[PDB]
Design a protein around this ligand. Sequence first.
Ligand SMILES: *[C@@H]1O[C@H](CO)[C@@H](O[C@@H]2O[C@H](CO)[C@@H](O)[C@H](O)[C@H]2NC(C)=O)[C@H](O)[C@H]1NC(C)=O
Ligand SMILES: *[C@@H]1O[C@H](CO)[C@@H](O)[C@H](O)[C@H]1NC(C)=O
Ligand SMILES: *[C@@H]1O[C@H](CO)[C@@H](O)[C@H](O)[C@H]1NC(C)=O
Ligand SMILES: *[C@@H]1O[C@H](CO)[C@@H](O)[C@H](O)[C@H]1NC(C)=O
Ligand SMILES: *[C@@H]1O[C@H](CO)[C@@H](O)[C@H](O)[C@H]1NC(C)=O
Lengths: 113, 50, 94, 98, 49, 82, 49, 37, 49, 46
Amino acid sequence: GTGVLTESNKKFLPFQQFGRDIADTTDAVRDPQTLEILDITPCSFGGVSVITPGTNTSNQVAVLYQGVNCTEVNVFQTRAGCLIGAEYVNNSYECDIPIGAGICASYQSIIAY
Amino acid sequence: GTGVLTESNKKFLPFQQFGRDIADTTDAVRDPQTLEILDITPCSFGGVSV
Amino acid sequence: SGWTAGAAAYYVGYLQPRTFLLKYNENGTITDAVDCALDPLSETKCTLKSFTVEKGIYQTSNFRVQPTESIVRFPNITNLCPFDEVFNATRFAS
Amino acid sequence: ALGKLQDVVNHNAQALNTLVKQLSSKFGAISSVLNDILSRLDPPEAEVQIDRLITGRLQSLQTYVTQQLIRAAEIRASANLAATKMSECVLGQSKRVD
Amino acid sequence: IDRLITGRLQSLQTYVTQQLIRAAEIRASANLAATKMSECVLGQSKRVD
Amino acid sequence: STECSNLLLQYGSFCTQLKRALTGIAVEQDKNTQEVFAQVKQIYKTPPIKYFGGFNFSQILPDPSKPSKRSPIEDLLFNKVT
Amino acid sequence: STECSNLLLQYGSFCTQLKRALTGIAVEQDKNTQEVFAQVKQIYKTPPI
Amino acid sequence: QCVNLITRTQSYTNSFTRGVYYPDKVFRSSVLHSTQD
Amino acid sequence: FVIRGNEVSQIAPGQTGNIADYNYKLPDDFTGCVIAWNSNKLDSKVGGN
Amino acid sequence: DLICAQKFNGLTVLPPLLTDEMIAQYTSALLAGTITSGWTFGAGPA
Ligand SMILES: *[C@@H]1O[C@H](CO)[C@@H](O[C@@H]2O[C@H](CO)[C@@H](O)[C@H](O)[C@H]2NC(C)=O)[C@H](O)[C@H]1NC(C)=O
Ligand SMILES: *[C@@H]1O[C@H](CO)[C@@H](O)[C@H](O)[C@H]1NC(C)=O
Ligand SMILES: *[C@@H]1O[C@H](CO)[C@@H](O)[C@H](O)[C@H]1NC(C)=O
Ligand SMILES: *[C@@H]1O[C@H](CO)[C@@H](O)[C@H](O)[C@H]1NC(C)=O
Ligand SMILES: *[C@@H]1O[C@H](CO)[C@@H](O)[C@H](O)[C@H]1NC(C)=O
């Protein structure tokens, strides 16, 4: 399996080796060589959205990493995700390209507001 | 396949043999004996309603 | 110095398994193309199957950090396993 | 201004194009062409290959018909609204706000 | 792997189909709510109930 | 392919179900057009002199010069939808 | 799994269809909120008394 | 008769948009075709 | 019947071969059993049966 | 741990475009227009 192996606070009983979640996917593991419980988490991932104006207008793009903090990926942190390539502007305008959570983007460079 | 082979106004490039539609359906072919282009039109069909 | 002095200039590149989007014109010649992976905008062009992308926000793919190395964890106990007692036995049972 | 009708036309054309594109899918079989599977294979596992193509094409066709049914329900709701507007805004004067 | 793909694909298509039907129901409810916003809040309605 | 149809016969009435559903959709479209547009059983005509107290309806009334007998607005709507 | 995705490529445009349907539902929800609540383009204020 | 006469220097440059070939022998007209190759 | 040793795979539905096409053809929807056993003691001669 | 199990298998929840405070600001504008101006703001100037 692929993931990160971290410290676990799960009190495994001595007979128990594997750990499973509500999804019945491998969540914790007991190493045979040293009898310690390793918490398995999937590596960092998320969805990628490309914010663009028309190609008749410009070829500049912005990238939204959805549900991803900006420390684990012009960098702006939204509730929708981490936005790269768009600068935040404190001025409020009508929504042009919807990002989410009240944030929209427009081309004027690409700004987010 | 099965279809009529009508005359084609398409000018193929000489390495190409088969031809396809926008929805990748074969619409044309070059003939190997005589280097000419033929439009493949599969045979006439219809819904019969009573 | 038995041979005439000369020079030759040539470029060498290597091929990788990539997804491309090709534009076929009305004469059948590939006139333009986009590489999907290299550019976000070009990945949007590959997703929309078009060279002109309208204004909007487009779900294209998923970012994922790749694994860096492989670790194999097996028990430390090493014992020679007696398969010779099974398969090289002179007499078997009914 | 005329986006909505164009969207309806686009959705119908896109669905039909997608359905024709689903005839090029192997669906885990050796080929997407039935005649090729006939030509390169003897019958008793060609039955399995053609069965895989048949269940893939049934899945595509049922997906298309279900999407068409949902879109038909949406268009029927829009047309019932349009008939209500024809009765109440054109054939009379309405006190209903907006 | 092909059996797992066809099972998971059928599960995903089932989920998307129920999501589309629920989206149609919620769109009908939201169109009703927009009508009530226009006719009960932005005006006085003589339609009974 | 005839043996493909022989294999398709083993799956039952799936094709009949899909054909029946699409026939229902097809008749529902014509039905929807009938409740939207066929709301009067009398085909009314405007008078030959189109004076209505200064109100101009030429952009919504049909154009006799055009073969489609459509209004200028309706002709624009038909040209702008492809 | 890379080979599982390679086998999934042989099933065609099913995943594109599911993503397109869910994107339509997702923009439909925001459209529903716009029809219900964004019925005025002026943000009116109550007087302080 | 193997004799050594050639020396060679090298630099690195940009491929730009070169190197694209026809993935098959199929005529296609005014379309967009996506291929993995 | 009696056949050659490499021809026992041809006694099967949908097989292509010499005896499958010209001697014994099985239908595609065949139901039943095939039995094969050697006959050197009875169906062979030292001068050639 | 249901949300993490959904997220780890590719099922993500997108946020709504309007936040709760913006929907509340829309309803406050509707309240203020209705109380201060009646039905007149729905048919033109308040
Ligand atoms: C009613 O409207 C039509 C169209 O708006 C008027 O026709 C225009 O008349 C002016 C002046 O005669 C011309 O310059 C325009 O080219 C006409 N437009 C078209 C589309 O024909 C018409 O004059 C108006 N009044 C009456 C009484 O019909
Ligand atoms: C080897 O594995 C056993 C468990 O099977 C463990 O008890 C022991 O401590 C391990 N030895 C070392 C040197 O880690
Ligand atoms: C093939 O045979 C035909 C028949 O004569 C001839 O016209 C043609 O030139 C030949 N060669 C090719 C490459 O088609
Ligand atoms: C295509 O073919 C026609 C006819 O041979 C030629 O005139 C034209 O220059 C070609 N190229 C393009 C881009 O149309
Ligand atoms: C197996 O048994 C034979 C005698 O029966 C012996 O000669 C041979 O060395 C044995 N092989 C192994 C691998 O023990």
